[PDB]
Amino acid sequence: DLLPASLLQISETEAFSRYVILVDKEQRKLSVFERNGEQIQKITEYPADIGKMKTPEGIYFLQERLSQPKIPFSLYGALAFTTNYPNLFDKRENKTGSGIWLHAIPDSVPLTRGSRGCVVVRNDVIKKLADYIKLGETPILIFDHVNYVSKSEHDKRRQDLSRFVESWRQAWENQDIEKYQTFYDEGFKAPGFNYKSWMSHKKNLKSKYEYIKVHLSQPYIVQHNDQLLVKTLQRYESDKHVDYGVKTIYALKSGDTYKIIREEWAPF
Amino acid sequence: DLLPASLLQISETEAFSRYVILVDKEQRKLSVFERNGEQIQKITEYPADIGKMGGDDHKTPEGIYFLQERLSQPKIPFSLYGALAFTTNYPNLFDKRENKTGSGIWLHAIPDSVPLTRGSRGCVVVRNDVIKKLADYIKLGETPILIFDHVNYVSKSEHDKRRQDLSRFVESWRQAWENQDIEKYQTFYDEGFKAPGFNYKSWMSHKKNLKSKYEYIKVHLSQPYIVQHNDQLLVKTLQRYESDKHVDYGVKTIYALKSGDTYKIIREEWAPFSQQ
Ligand SMILES: [Br-]
Ligand SMILES: [Br-]
Ligand SMILES: [Br-]
Ligand SMILES: [Br-]
Ligand SMILES: [Br-]
Ligand SMILES: [Br-]
Ligand SMILES: [Br-]
Ligand SMILES: [Br-]
Ligand SMILES: [Br-]
Ligand SMILES: [Br-]
Ligand SMILES: [Br-]
Ligand SMILES: [Br-]
Ligand SMILES: [Br-]
Ligand SMILES: [Br-]
Ligand SMILES: [Br-]
Ligand SMILES: [Br-]
Ligand SMILES: [Br-]
Ligand SMILES: [Br-]
Ligand SMILES: [Br-]
């Protein structure tokens, strides 16, 4: 009936993850959602809690799978999955610490006896969750509060953010520098760039390659509190040359809209 | 004839890099070294400098890094980076422990008309012809770049002595672990040790628990990379671990700091390895 307001869309790209794990700390529940075309749908849910031995919230991806004998069953159960904590939003504010894993624990031990901020589930549960996880790809969203909205409200929020992404893509493809610039925060950073050098490079590229095409696959879209994360397979065509890459934008709320603070690209 | 005191050995493991890049800030030189068995051999050398732009002590980071990604146009501007850039893993685990990290470090080029020092603060900058030559030696994710304010060149005799000294340290650690001599093994670790999921106490408790269950283990290490510079020691090896229950192979990286006349491990990483 209802859908999580902060998970708006799962990417259609099959090299990414068709599943997203959503941890609702207030409900003590971990849910698995799957793409259904442009829609999302809940597949399953399990009890979960946060280790207690404020805890972080954020938008993460699962990276590695660990088990015995590398990690002790007494602390982690049969399996642990690491995350990319601290992410770029976390680093922007110098967040560090022991890290965030999704892991299990012995049956005799409460889930809250896990290490602080880790997501802890039962040993039987982690073995089932492993089947949904594509290492390096599957998101894990860890939120204090999850607002559930009607399907019609969810569709509206998704379309609102889809229009934001499209207006950005269009301004980029048009090489309409004046419009494109407005999507970026003056504190923007990317590897090798600040706001000024990023815009200067975009203007210089336009001077060399007048016509470009930018295509974005149906993206992951997550929007929780101030944060917006969009991840897509991007096709860039310019000067009869082409490249495909994984494009991730990180943005923060700015008045009634958002401004991009970080932009990443990796070859695909 | 002389050899850099800080680069003691290159790993024999072909999944890693047989080449190491060494940057000597004082001499404004970048050299390529290649593994020759247990020895190292300098194969080429070019001018290089450190970028000074957009940086009060006026100094730039130094350390023991690995090259990660290769970038070129149209992703990055030629005006700033010339024909190619290679990113690093800066800040590494040593840098994170010191918690005074700055702007990123790349190895890149620049237009022919401008000085190498126009690069951004701390980057290693070379000419366009040079960066294209270096690309032939760089294995992404594997090739070290050692960025040192100063380089101490020593005799081959002195170099081999230092290499053997550190090899004996590593072997002593390996033997203590393999013997599951917990008293001896513990002496190799700093009390502030951390690894993913562990501190000193939980690391030692896990090792003691494994010992209680699996009486005899085997630990084998491929000939390691060994770098020792300033307070830091980095050892990287392909490790085979065997108990009666399982065998695993993985990449083992040890980060250690000087302690009196020896070293204590502050971080220890393992990543699984497979051919198949
Ligand atoms: Br796709
Ligand atoms: Br991928
Ligand atoms: Br619940
Ligand atoms: Br800030
Ligand atoms: Br944490
Ligand atoms: Br159990
Ligand atoms: Br419980
Ligand atoms: Br898995
Ligand atoms: Br499944
Ligand atoms: Br939500
Ligand atoms: Br304009
Ligand atoms: Br960044
Ligand atoms: Br908006
Ligand atoms: Br891009
Ligand atoms: Br030249
Ligand atoms: Br040296
Ligand atoms: Br660590
Ligand atoms: Br942990
Ligand atoms: Br290990």
Numbering used by the authors:
A (entry chain B): 29 to 81, 92 to 306
B (entry chain A): 29 to 83, 89 to 309
List passages from the publication reporting this PDB structure.
The structure of mature Bd1075 protein was determined to 1.34 Å. The Bd1075 structure contains two domains: the catalytic LD-CPase domain (aa 47–180) and a C-terminal nuclear transport factor 2 (NTF2)-like domain (aa 196–304). Interestingly, although there was a global agreement in the fold to Csd6 of H. pylori and Pgp2 of C. jejuni which also contain an NTF2 domain and an LD-CPase domain (the junction between the two at residue 188 of Bd1075), there were significant differences in fold elements and local regions. We were able to trace residues 29–308 with the exception of a presumably flexible region (aa 82–91) which we term the active site ‘lid’. The termini of Bd1075 are very different to both Csd6 and Pgp2, replacing the N-terminal dimerization domain of those enzymes with a simple, shorter loop, and extending the C-terminus such that the Bd1075 NTF2 domain finishes with a longer beta-strand (aa 295–306)—residues of which contribute to its binding pocket. Most noteworthy within the core of the Bd1075 C-terminus was the presence of W303, which is clearly located within the substrate-binding pocket of the NTF2 domain. We postulate that its position has been modified in our Bd1075 structure by sidechains contacting the P107/K108 loop and may thus represent a ‘bound’ state.
Bdellovibrio bacteriovorus HD100 is a small, vibrioid-shaped predatory bacterium that invades and then replicates within the periplasm of Gram-negative prey bacteria, forming a spherical structure called a prey bdelloplast. The protein, Bd1075, generates cell curvature in B. bacteriovorus by exerting LD-carboxypeptidase activity upon the predator cell wall as it grows inside spherical prey. Bd1075 is targeted to the outer convex cell face by its C-terminal nuclear transport factor 2-like (NTF2) domain, where it exerts localized LD-carboxypeptidase (LD-CPase) activity upon the B. bacteriovorus PG wall to generate curvature and the classical vibrio shape.
